[PDB]
Amino acid sequence: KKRFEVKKWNAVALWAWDIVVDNCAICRNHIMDLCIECQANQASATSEECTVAWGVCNHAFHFHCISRWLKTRQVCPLDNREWEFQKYGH
Amino acid sequence: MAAAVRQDLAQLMNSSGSHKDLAGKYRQILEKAIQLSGAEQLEALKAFVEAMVNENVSLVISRQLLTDFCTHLPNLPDSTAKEIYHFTLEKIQPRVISFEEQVASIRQHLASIYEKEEDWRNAAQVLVGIPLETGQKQYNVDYKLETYLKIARLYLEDDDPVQAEAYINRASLLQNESTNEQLQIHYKVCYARVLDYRRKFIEAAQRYNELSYKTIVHESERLEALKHALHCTILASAGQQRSRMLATLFKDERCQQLAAYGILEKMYLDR
Amino acid sequence: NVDLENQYYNSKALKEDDPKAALSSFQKVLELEGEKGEWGFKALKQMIKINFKLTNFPEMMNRYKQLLTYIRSAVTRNYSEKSINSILDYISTSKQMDLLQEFYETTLEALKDAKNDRLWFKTNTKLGKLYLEREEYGKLQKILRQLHQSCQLKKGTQLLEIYALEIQMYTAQKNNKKLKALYEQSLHIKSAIPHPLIMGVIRECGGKMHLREGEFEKAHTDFFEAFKNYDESGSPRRTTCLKYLVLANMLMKSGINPFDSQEAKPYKNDPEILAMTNLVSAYQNNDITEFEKILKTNHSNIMDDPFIREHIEELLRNIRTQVLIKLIKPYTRIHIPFISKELNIDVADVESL
Amino acid sequence: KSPELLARYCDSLLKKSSKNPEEAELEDTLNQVMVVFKYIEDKDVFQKFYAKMLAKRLVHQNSASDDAEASMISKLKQACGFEYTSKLQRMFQDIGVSKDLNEQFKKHLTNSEPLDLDFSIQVLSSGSWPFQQSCTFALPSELERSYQRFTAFYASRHSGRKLTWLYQLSKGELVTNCFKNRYTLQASTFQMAILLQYNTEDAYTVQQLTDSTQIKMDILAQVLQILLKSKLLVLEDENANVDEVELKPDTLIKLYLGYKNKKLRVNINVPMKEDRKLLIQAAIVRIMKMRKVLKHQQLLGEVLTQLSSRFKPRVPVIKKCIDILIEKEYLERVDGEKDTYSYLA
Numbered sequence A: 001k002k003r004f005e006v007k008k009w010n011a012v013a014l015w016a017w018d019i020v021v022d023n024c025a026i027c028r029n030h031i032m033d034l035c036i037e038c039q040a041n042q043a044s045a046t047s048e049e050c051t052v053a054w055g056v057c058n059h060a061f062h063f064h065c066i067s068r069w070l071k072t073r074q075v076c077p078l079d080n081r082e083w084e085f086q087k088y089g090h
Numbered sequence B: 001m002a003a004a005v006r007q008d009l010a011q012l013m014n015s016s017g018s019h020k021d022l023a024g025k026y027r028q029i030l031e032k033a034i035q036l037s038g039a040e041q042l043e044a045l046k047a048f049v050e051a052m053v054n055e056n057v058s059l060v061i062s063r064q065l066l067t068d069f070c071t072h073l074p075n076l077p078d079s080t081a082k083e084i085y086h087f088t089l090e091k092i093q094p095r096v097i098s099f100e101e102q103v104a105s106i107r108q109h110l111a112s113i114y115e116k117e118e119d120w121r122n123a124a125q126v127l128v129g130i131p132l133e134t135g136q137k138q139y140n141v142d143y144k145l146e147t148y149l150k151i152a153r154l155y156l157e158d159d160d161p162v163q164a165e166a167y168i169n170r171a172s173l174l175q176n177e178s179t180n181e182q183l184q185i186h187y188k189v190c191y192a193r194v195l196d197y198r199r200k201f202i203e204a205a206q207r208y209n210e211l212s213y214k215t216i217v218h219e220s221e222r223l224e225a226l227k228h229a230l231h232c233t234i235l236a237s238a239g240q241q242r243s244r245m246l247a248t249l250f251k252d253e254r255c256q257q258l259a260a261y262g263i264l265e266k267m268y269l270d271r
Numbered sequence C: 001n002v003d004l005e006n007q008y009y010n011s012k013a014l015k016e017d018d019p020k021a022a023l024s025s026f027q028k029v030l031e032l033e034g035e036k037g038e039w040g041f042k043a044l045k046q047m048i049k050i051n052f053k054l055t056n057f058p059e060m061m062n063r064y065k066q067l068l069t070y071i072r073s074a075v076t077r078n079y080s081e082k083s084i085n086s087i088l089d090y091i092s093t094s095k096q097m098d099l100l101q102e103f104y105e106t107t108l109e110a111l112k113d114a115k116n117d118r119l120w121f122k123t124n125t126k127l128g129k130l131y132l133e134r135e136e137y138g139k140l141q142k143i144l145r146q147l148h149q150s151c152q153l154k155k156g157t158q159l160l161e162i163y164a165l166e167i168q169m170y171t172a173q174k175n176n177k178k179l180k181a182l183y184e185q186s187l188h189i190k191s192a193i194p195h196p197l198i199m200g201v202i203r204e205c206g207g208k209m210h211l212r213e214g215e216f217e218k219a220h221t222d223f224f225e226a227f228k229n230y231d232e233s234g235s236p237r238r239t240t241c242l243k244y245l246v247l248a249n250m251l252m253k254s255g256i257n258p259f260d261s262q263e264a265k266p267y268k269n270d271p272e273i274l275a276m277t278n279l280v281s282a283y284q285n286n287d288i289t290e291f292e293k294i295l296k297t298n299h300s301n302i303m304d305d306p307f308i309r310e311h312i313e314e315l316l317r318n319i320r321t322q323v324l325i326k327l328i329k330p331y332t333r334i335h336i337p338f339i340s341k342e343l344n345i346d347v348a349d350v351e352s353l
Numbered sequence D: 001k002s003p004e005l006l007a008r009y010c011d012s013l014l015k016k017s018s019k020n021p022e023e024a025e026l027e028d029t030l031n032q033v034m035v036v037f038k039y040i041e042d043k044d045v046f047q048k049f050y051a052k053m054l055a056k057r058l059v060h061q062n063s064a065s066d067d068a069e070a071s072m073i074s075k076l077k078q079a080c081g082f083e084y085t086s087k088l089q090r091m092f093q094d095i096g097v098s099k100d101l102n103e104q105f106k107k108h109l110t111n112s113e114p115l116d117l118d119f120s121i122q123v124l125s126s127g128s129w130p131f132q133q134s135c136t137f138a139l140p141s142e143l144e145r146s147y148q149r150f151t152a153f154y155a156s157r158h159s160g161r162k163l164t165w166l167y168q169l170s171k172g173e174l175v176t177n178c179f180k181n182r183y184t185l186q187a188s189t190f191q192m193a194i195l196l197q198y199n200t201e202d203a204y205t206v207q208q209l210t211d212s213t214q215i216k217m218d219i220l221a222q223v224l225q226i227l228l229k230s231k232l233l234v235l236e237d238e239n240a241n242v243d244e245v246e247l248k249p250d251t252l253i254k255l256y257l258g259y260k261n262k263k264l265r266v267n268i269n270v271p272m273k274e275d276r277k278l279l280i281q282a283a284i285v286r287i288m289k290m291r292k293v294l295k296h297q298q299l300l301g302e303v304l305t306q307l308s309s310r311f312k313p314r315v316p317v318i319k320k321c322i323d324i325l326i327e328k329e330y331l332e333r334v335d336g337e338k339d340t341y342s343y344l345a
């Protein structure tokens, strides 16, 4: 019937999470806020700016929260494996 | 019964070839059918969007004709516009990936007439249907930011803070790299309102206080931010955090202009 | 030659519902195929497929013995493996166990010398999977006996497949003692590249064994790994290791919401996991009124499996303890009956706590 | 360049040719490659060109002996470590997962209304593959329904995941029903769309094809050039040499009705084609002087705080900086803790 008919298609795709990150699971605050401890004490430090820190597992906590957590424990809060910095920035 | 037009709609679909010359002929016929009194007007437009989404029409004149069809709806009275808008979205639904641009424009138009009629719940639902992430087309960042704020604002006026917070969370991922200064100001106004709605009064007070120092906004809007900051600080939870903010508000000279300043000065002096 | 491609393409171009007509048209193909070629492999596959449709059972097994002469060097290993995997798969849906059973014994005879190490390994492992779903625990043991004399590293990947098979086998037998030994037996291998479903059975049993033993900080990470791998590949058991991950997180003294990672957030509103996500939100930010109400409502989703009903007594006590600690923080002298009201327990049990 | 050459050797070895080496000798030559591999002083660079070579090998299904691929990465993992082969392990697992995914999708198709074409897709993964969506493309009307179907299958199975299709790396097969005989050609998605545009009419201009497929100028020009090389699209002036013909958006290219190529398996889808280190060292030594004893993770965090705000350095570069500073006897490891540094000036 049709002049040209397609019989086989071999596509390639890329799956990604719909929400990259929506909450810092340490202070329970949102990613763009000032990490709770650095929220109440609104003076400086925000200069350093609570830029998020991405681990190897790509979990993306606040840098203040993850650094404060790393002082005693060396395990990621969620997957409970070794924590290793991989990325830093927005 | 006067339906002597619908027959040639299907007849032209099965012609020898569709070109640009025939596309312009539809304008003349459409321009007279629109200029009609009653139900006879509705039938012509209803079948126009039915016989166009068909596979028999190539997607080279169909896309151009669909956006031209939708651009003539705002001139049409909104009572009929609501009915036709729902129908075309249902007919495009089987094949959405092809018309990933016409759907967005139609839902924006439908939401605009819904909000003007004071229906916040239904207007918000329409704007959700727009695929802004799960689509093949990459939209502009300012477009996604603007749409998210509209959804959050409509949910706030619906008194549904849980849904409004979710969409303002999606909008806060694009502020840092966005370049529209007005859009950044507009986001913080909606974010502060969301925090106030969620009964996070002390956090909203900080945002309102910072927003009150913006030289971009007008003087009248600057005082409105200060008024909301004063009310939120008073309504917040007493403690070390709230007491520190109370001292900051007392230093402000503009705080004396409000009728709720006497209460502010008593709570400042531990009265 | 170009003629070989044209001859093969003509046969598939015709639907040829009439049988025995293509057979004379493949004698041409074999004569035209002088050297070893990939087109010969495809020709044999098609005639087996066509003949199989109109029964005639004694035909496929004769051509199949000719077929393993192509896996040697005629074609690649991906193509040959895919052909075998596809053929054995879609014929099992039609039941017909006897025809499939006679095939496995005959293929093993010649495949044992054509492709020795890897293809025979995966065919044997697939055969073991058939025995498990039909629950025939009377002949799977001899297969594992053969696999016993296969290692004696550099063979870590193959070792994980059989170890996972044994764990899935003994799990149905409720053999907890052998499960602990098996889980440690697989922990030594650390240079393998397994499918993300093999590392979803040894990891799940590791979390389960930790739960029974009494460790709650090791079950949390094991169940997270089991859920992560089950989520990527597969489906059914995904919403069982997430529920166990939640339980293994509340028994660990909680902290950090389990439904905040990227993997677990989409399933937080699942109709099956709605009971558990409400439980965590009540456990953290301790409040007894909402926590008990959830337990009372759901007798069909929480107090059913032994892994939650047995560990529900360790809970309902950690939350009461944490409520007690926070309540008595500002007081210096507090009545015990007052504590009883705030904990919804009688006076006698408050003193014991 | 020698590492690159060794890796291209690896590529041949595993890829695919007319002759397939036996599984016994395939690992034998792989062992020899690992004999020289440990002699290589720099290991980081080898993974750089091995990632893109492997990705092209697997995404096109051009790999030979995928079992040998698993053992190859298995040998690498125990050689340098997990971190060195973590990215490549993701690539192999994505192929295995998607192969299982295809089998379930076919079963789902039978229980519902079947499609009209044999559809297979490799899902891959975002963040681990060098590929990225770079060319805009309009989905053909014939390849849309199946598209939507698969999306549904990927929405009921996996929730919260969004697909980003890569039409640049997607191939396919197209049958013909108007030639002298029944042909079956193989072409990419772009060529398939261009050739399916001619389904309803005879001749189109270049602009009429650009505005119908929404492909960008350079890729569209290259695709038209290769299609003209296959003499499938014939220009008005036959005697003009195709290579030197200058293409403009006014030529009326028409489908060659009288195509009479002898081969019925025409394959027209043939492939084409220092200062910062000193800054990191200075930051590390300053942080070590400020904090006399530190852990590796805390040192990494401090370096990211002080210095990464400027140019966002890569973590392996910082690790190499730590190693070279250790060699310069600027900071020493402490016994009893594997990851602990003390500033020994």
Ligand SMILES: [Zn+2]
Binding pocket: A024, A025, A026, A027, A028, A029, A035, A036, A061, A062, A065
């Ligand atoms: Zn935080």
Ligand SMILES: [Zn+2]
Binding pocket: A034, A035, A036, A037, A038, A039, A045, A046, A049, A050, A064
């Ligand atoms: Zn902070």
Ligand SMILES: [Zn+2]
Binding pocket: A055, A057, A058, A059, A076, A077, A078, A079, A080, A081
């Ligand atoms: Zn983690």
